[PDB]
Design a protein around this ligand. Structure first.
Ligand code: POV
Ligand code: POV
Ligand code: POV
Ligand code: POV
Ligand code: POV
Ligand code: DNQ
Ligand code: DNQ
Ligand code: 2J9
Ligand code: 2J9
Ligand code: 2J9
Ligand code: 2J9
Ligand code: CL
Ligand code: NA
Ligand code: NA
Ligand code: NA
Ligand code: NA
Ligand code: NA
Ligand code: NA
Ligand code: NA
Lengths: 420, 420, 420, 420
């Protein structure tokens, strides 16, 4: 006779086909556990009739009397022959029904939003000093160079002889004009000295204190840039639950009374009870009621959702903003459910192991869990200083070579007006 | 018998549950002393049946009537059978009731605000070299340039032809005068070369060694400042009670008529009687009325709040800018009270010693005192240095320009005196 | 009945105790499978009574006689009652014996030597700026000095009196030639000033902007190198199997006639058949005879050793220069064997699922696979930089001096051609 | 009658007095528990006779029949009245004897050798580059400057006119002698350019490649010095057992079957079972048999001994090379032992609490646990670069100013021989 396969609606598992023809005859279904059910029926002979569970439930000790609702009800009443579905092999179900041997391995892992292209700025060289320090240095270049001008006109020792070769006199000039006083201050600031040095002691205390001011500015730029660039290099993203146990800034998640939330209750691993101390205290904010609303709260907030790995690897392949941070915490499996007795327990256990040696259970997971190929990495590595973080010293370079053409035209016109 | 348990309302010892439907009846509230009273009752038979004390006190002997208040009046009149609460084992209570053997150990310790590092000074650029090094560099410039003035006069090759711009002969002049030798030493130190370069070989060895000296000093300033900025290490001004006995800048704090104030009043230790000489003099300048009023004055005023040490370990893990400085000053203990003739003294004394070696007094304390955790050991991208960090190079700049005006006037008078 | 348990000698599964007096009798040895066989026996009645297999094999079907070897011959002849050992659930064994439901989960993964950072290259000084930046600076020197040659000829104030050493007039000469403008740009870039300083205002804006450009580039080189040297971050050349399918420089490894070599022989995946195209061609060039011989060739030769994933997690925590690259390739499992007609299949299937949810399969694995820990995340005081780190500045120095001889000969010929 | 005080030999507890007079009459004893026994007898009236335990044992379940050897034998047989001794209040003893209430609080803490004055060298500035790099730079200053000399004599474009003021000829000189070629190479190396720049393209490629070599040397000195100085600042010493659980380099200790070794057996704190995994595996090396041999193994090896806090605070005050790293792990206490019944249980419990309010139990611990005042700190803080780590640039400074006097004498003599 044709077997009765009691299954449930899940994705990429048993689904509905997108079509319109109303008379189906168990051809309305599609998914991983329908492609698995064809290949079990192929090598074991049987015909089958896919009849969904009416309760829409997997299986649960009802704990007032224990009527075992769901797909384990259809098996324990012998109303069903198979339960080809994601029917997880757990302890309380193995006593009342006979599973097959696993066709799927999962655990508990963490969803998180994928870290993206950090933009520290095109003008991000300007960060190691405060925005008033860059102003107070520029107001000290305009301040010292005016004090250089006043002192070098007033001190009698700067008024040297511009032609000492001929030992005569009557021509006495400073090299410190107003234009050459800013060029000392700009020149001494940029660590590359100008063509003109102070000659009097009163101007050698201006120049000698503008040189010490300049050392502390350039050294505290280089040492605070070293402090910025080595902290963001020392900063590594979270890649574990041992990481999540420490940062209370990144928020945890689970499902209301699921297999994940049950695991963190009965836990003596001592990382995960601290992860349960987060949940019992901060409940009704960190404890969402479904798998789909847990994805949305990662996608809105800074939320780290604790899902099973078979539906983390499904959502991550369909949403390149999402990632899986770490490894398997638990270790569970999916098995074809059978009632107790059931000569098809061993026949499917042989049949699953035959499809694993041939490699079909990997080709059926790649057929349903790939979806789209992601935009690859966009070179997500870093730490070499490039155009995206030091590339705004090229705008300032280009804006200084355009302004100098505006003055070179302006000097050519003022010289031409001088000829008239 | 349910054995009525008198109990006061304290945190994190006896806290209301406050989650749902407000009707339980002796399941209304939770905490450390209620988890303790469970595993006493689990080993020793009975049920909880807490009967929270009407008068909100622990117990004290008013001398006007010689009567007891709080809980230890409810013990002696046998209208309570236990006192499972933070009831401290004091001498005057031990003569009246009998205590069990302690379930917590504590003393007197000090709250102080956690060190911050937002005011490092205004000469905090001067830190990466010790003040012995900043003086030895200043004595090296005076040392080298006095060697340069001696060598360059004595060396025959520093005396040259001071006009090759017209080939005439019989002219012998040196460039290294006294002012021109200190300007080489200052100029070579500030990484910006002066207009004077040595010529013979001997001043090129004084010149070349002073250049290698200078690279090692500037690179050690830049690389120790780059260590000071990425690794922030804050230091508190006090780390004990004798260090806090000396600081009159930091004012103290304790509850008026508490177990802490009675310790310093009755003390004979030279530190703890000097510490009473402060807070008896000031007296409502440094004496708050409760524990919560004193915690706020650590947060608002400066402060030094002398309180019990289990209440500090509670508050230090909720607030992350409150820290415990020093160790325990007194040594006291919380014991479960019981009436004078009571079998439950010894039976709980055995029971408290049973949960300890099994480890349950520690695991309850890990449950009810731990909190957020304060995980701020990962530094932010250090700081944009402002006028709070470099800061005092704008002070020494203006101090060097005011000094330059006073030399320019002095060179203006020394020339007009030469005209006379 | 003691129920004779056949068992093979493996690590860290079945290890001799070796501490004292050599006479116990089925208490001689310890491990993971013996801790497992305890808590199976603790729940299910019986005592251990291990009866270690004489023929040191697991079981294989020689086709010449169709007989079984190892343990799974000792199961089918009912001369053993359990097989508590790493007996892998294979298809041909499942048709012959019945397995329990898995107590470990594993697959195929890759050993590779942990990345080292002792050969960063010889041009590893060039890393703190990206190769786009090293080209844009070279195009900036060509860009600025071609602007300097245009502006300084056009600016009327760069043309001056080129001998104030004798006051004679009617002489108009510029210092910014073509060779003298690239020497300003190279000189100002290398932080060491050339003998040419601009004079007008327009070349002082080209000069002053190129000085501020240069401070930001040299300070960003020094501060990103100071991040690269204190935070060592090593990268492996391979992190998967398809990245290792491409690298012909890295040769593979697997046991001859193992469960891993049979996977790649029978595969149809485009990567895992390309990976078989390598190691079937080479064949005793990349095929070791055991697991221990293959681990040594990762340590001595380069290597890529494809083996099981629980043996990697054992070896990766003993050696701290062996690492696991990539994830699991196959998916298999270790199941407790039992004979074909056996009640102990289902009773241990319930029992393995009982220790899992209580957490005992994880806590046994934490006991027997963990080791030293490899705690080398704290860096040593970084490195004295040698000819392995800076290194290639002695190459570009000698390449710049050999190029200088070829220009000096070319200037010697261009002068002797001018004599003709 | 006179009570019988059964005590044991311990330090600073019950000892022998250093004298010679043989007829004592319980005046041969001295220590903390003898000064405590005087003050208990003072306020409770009784006279006492100190009679040591003959077994020399504290107390132990003999576990073949349980004869309770030691000081608990003298109490349970009523052969003793008091047990004024460090008789620790533990669970199994409280059932068979009656302790008093504690006169002493301890726990479990860690001995370690105190970190001392680190000598990184007086010449410790020389560390950021390898000792062959400092040689290869000094051989490249002697190598380039000889290539400068050969090219500047051979290139026809360096032979300029040393007096271009007069437009005549016949005097043509280089400024690149052999002496001025080393002064370029030394001058360009020290980031402070000399008075002489190259004039030909063949010498501007030598100078232009010696300037790029120099930038990478000074930047990789400053960035590797920043890497040295920020790693030893990021390196903090161990101050916990959470620290000791990670470093497998620092070796643990305990006593053979003591109260400390028993605590790490029965431990679920999950830091300390890893600390027991160190002990069971590495036994007979990390597990010494007495408290005195554990002190010696800290004092010889890098060993971290787990002792009680009352004898860590005794040894640390007598040996300034030893320290206590962390806090109390366990929490125990010392009580006066009494048999069951015993009207002196409550009388001493009142008497101990009276001596605690007056503060005598702190004055009796300071009398016996101080010993010597330690040499204070010798300023054990750090991280400001001082004379002990950069002070060898002052020897090289002083050795260059002495060598230059030797050349200044040598130039004065060669000039004097030139006059002849
Ligand atoms: C890259 C640079 C390295 C190499 C170059 C080194 C250059 C050599 C010169 C170095 C001079 C440095 C002064 C040494 C003072 C040491 C004492 C001290 O630490 O504290 C005192 C500093 O009080 C002051 O006066 C600081 C003044 C700084 C500049 C003074 C000379 C100006 C430079 C002249 C230019 C020509 C000099 C050349 C020769 C004449 C007291 O201040 P404080 O407030 O108590 O600070 C601590 C408290 N706080 C932080 C919490 C606020
Ligand atoms: C403080 C300094 C910053 C500011 C100053 C910057 C100065 C501006 C000049 C910058 C020139 C730098 C060249 C950059 C090349 C980029 C490509 C690359 O990264 O790899 C290539 C480098 O191969 C080479 O050839 C490197 C040669 C370096 C010096 C070349 C010019 C000489 C200096 C001219 C002096 C006058 C110049 C002035 C204008 C003429 C290939 O090598 P690789 O082996 O594949 O390396 C990776 C592999 N490995 C590490 C694992 C081994
Ligand atoms: C930013 C700077 C880079 C660029 C500048 C490069 C500078 C030039 C190259 C310099 C090479 C230096 C050689 C040292 C090699 C190490 C050997 C050694 O340690 O022996 C001795 C050190 O010996 C010295 O102290 C040497 C002092 C430096 C020489 C100064 C010359 C300046 C001019 C040069 C002009 C060029 C000459 C051309 C002339 C025409 C002993 O020291 P120690 O045993 O280690 O001390 C014990 C403590 N410790 C072990 C704990 C650490
Ligand atoms: C004549 C020139 C020789 C001088 C040499 C100098 C060498 C060493 C000199 C000083 C070092 C010794 C300092 C010891 C500590 C004293 C504390 C102190 O004064 O700090 C005070 C200021 O700090 C200063 O003002 C420092 C003086 C700077 C002017 C010197 C310029 C000389 C430049 C030489 C050029 C070379 C010329 C070359 C020659 C050819 C701090 O005061 P405050 O209370 O914290 O203020 C807070 C203000 N607030 C409220 C706004 C926040
Ligand atoms: C694979 C790499 C190629 C090399 C081949 C490998 C092997 C070599 C094989 C053969 C040797 C080839 C060398 C050329 C011929 C030798 C003689 C000579 O130079 O001729 C003449 C032209 O002089 C010049 O070429 C330079 C002067 C003009 C400037 C040109 C742009 C400068 C950029 C270049 C550097 C960019 C770096 C900086 C960029 C920021 C010499 O005349 P001059 O006296 O020098 O100039 C006259 C001005 N003066 C009269 C006022 C004084
Ligand atoms: O056996 C089960 N299988 C499940 C399978 C899935 N699944 O996603 O395939 C889910 N779930 O949707 O979270 C819950 C399950 N609960 C179960 O009890
Ligand atoms: O009750 C005890 N008291 C002890 C006191 C001490 N003590 O040092 O005073 C020691 N000990 O010497 O390690 C061991 C002890 N063991 C005990 O069981
Ligand atoms: O629930 S099971 O059928 N038996 C228990 N386990 C594990 C021991 C890890 C596993 C591990 C992976 C599976 F696919 C199934 C199971
Ligand atoms: O009030 S007690 O029961 N007896 C006196 N003492 C101390 C001697 C320190 C201590 C010390 C710690 C406690 F927990 C209890 C007490
Ligand atoms: O050999 S099995 O018992 N059945 C087949 N499989 C897999 C489907 C992957 C797995 C996967 C993990 C196991 F632990 C066991 C098995
Ligand atoms: O062995 S006891 O008499 N009772 C148990 N405890 C502690 C709860 C920490 C303590 C703590 C400190 C003591 F001094 C005595 C004891
Ligand atoms: Cl008691
Ligand atoms: Na079953
Ligand atoms: Na310069
Ligand atoms: Na750094
Ligand atoms: Na009493
Ligand atoms: Na079978
Ligand atoms: Na730096
Ligand atoms: Na007792």
């Amino acid at each position: 006779r044709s077997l009765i396969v009691t299954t449930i609606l899940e994705e990429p598992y048993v689904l509905f086909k997108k079509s319109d023809k109303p008379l189906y005859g168990n051809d309305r279904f599609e998914g991983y556990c329908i492609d698995l059910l064809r290949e079990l029926s192929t090598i074991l002979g049987f015909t089958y009739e896919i009849r969904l569970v009416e309760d829409g439930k997997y299986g649960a000790q009802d704990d007032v009397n224990g009527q075992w609702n769901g797909m384990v009800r259809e098996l324990i009443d012998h109303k069903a022959d198979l339960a080809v579905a994601p029917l997880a092999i757990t302890y309380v179900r193995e006593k009342v029904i006979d599973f097959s041997k696993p066709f799927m391995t999962l655990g508990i892992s963490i969803l998180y939003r994928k870290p993206n292209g950090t933009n520290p700025g095109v003008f991000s060289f300007l960060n190691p000093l405060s925005p008033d320090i860059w102003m107070y240095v520029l107001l000290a270049c305009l301040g010292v160079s005016c004090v250089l001008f006043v002192i070098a006109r007033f001190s009698p020792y700067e008024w040297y002889n511009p032609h000492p070769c001929n030992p005569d006199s009557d021509v006495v000039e400073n090299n410190f004009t107003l234009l050459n006083s800013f060029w000392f201050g700009v020149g001494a600031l940029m660590q590359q000295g100008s063509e003109l040095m102070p000659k009097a002691l009163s101007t050698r205390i201006v120049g000698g204190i503008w040189w010490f001011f300049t050392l502390i500015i350039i050294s505290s730029y280089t040492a605070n840039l070293a402090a910025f660039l080595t902290v963001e290099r020392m900063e590594s993203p979270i890649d574990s639950a041992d990481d999540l146990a420490k940062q209370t800034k990144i928020e945890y998640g689970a499902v209301e009374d699921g297999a994940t939330m049950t695991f963190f209750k009965k836990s003596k691993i001592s990382t995960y009870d601290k992860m349960w101390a987060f949940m019992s205290s901060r409940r009704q904010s960190v404890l969402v009621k479904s798998n789909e609303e847990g994805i949305q709260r990662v996608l809105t907030s800074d939320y780290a959702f604790l899902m099973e790995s078979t539906t983390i690897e499904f959502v991550t392949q369909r949403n390149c903003n999402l990632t899986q941070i770490g490894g398997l915490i638990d270790s569970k499996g999916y098995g074809v459910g059978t009632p107790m007795g059931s000569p098809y327990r061993d026949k499917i256990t042989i049949a699953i192991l035959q499809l694993q040696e041939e490699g079909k259970l990997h080709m059926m997971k790649e057929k349903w869990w790939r979806g789209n190929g992601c935009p690859e990495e966009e070179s997500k590595e870093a730490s070499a200083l490039g155009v995206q973080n030091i590339g705004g010293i090229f705008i300032v370079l280009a804006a200084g070579l355009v302004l100098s053409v505006f003055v070179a035209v302006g000097e050519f016109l003022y010289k031409s007006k001088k000829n008239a």
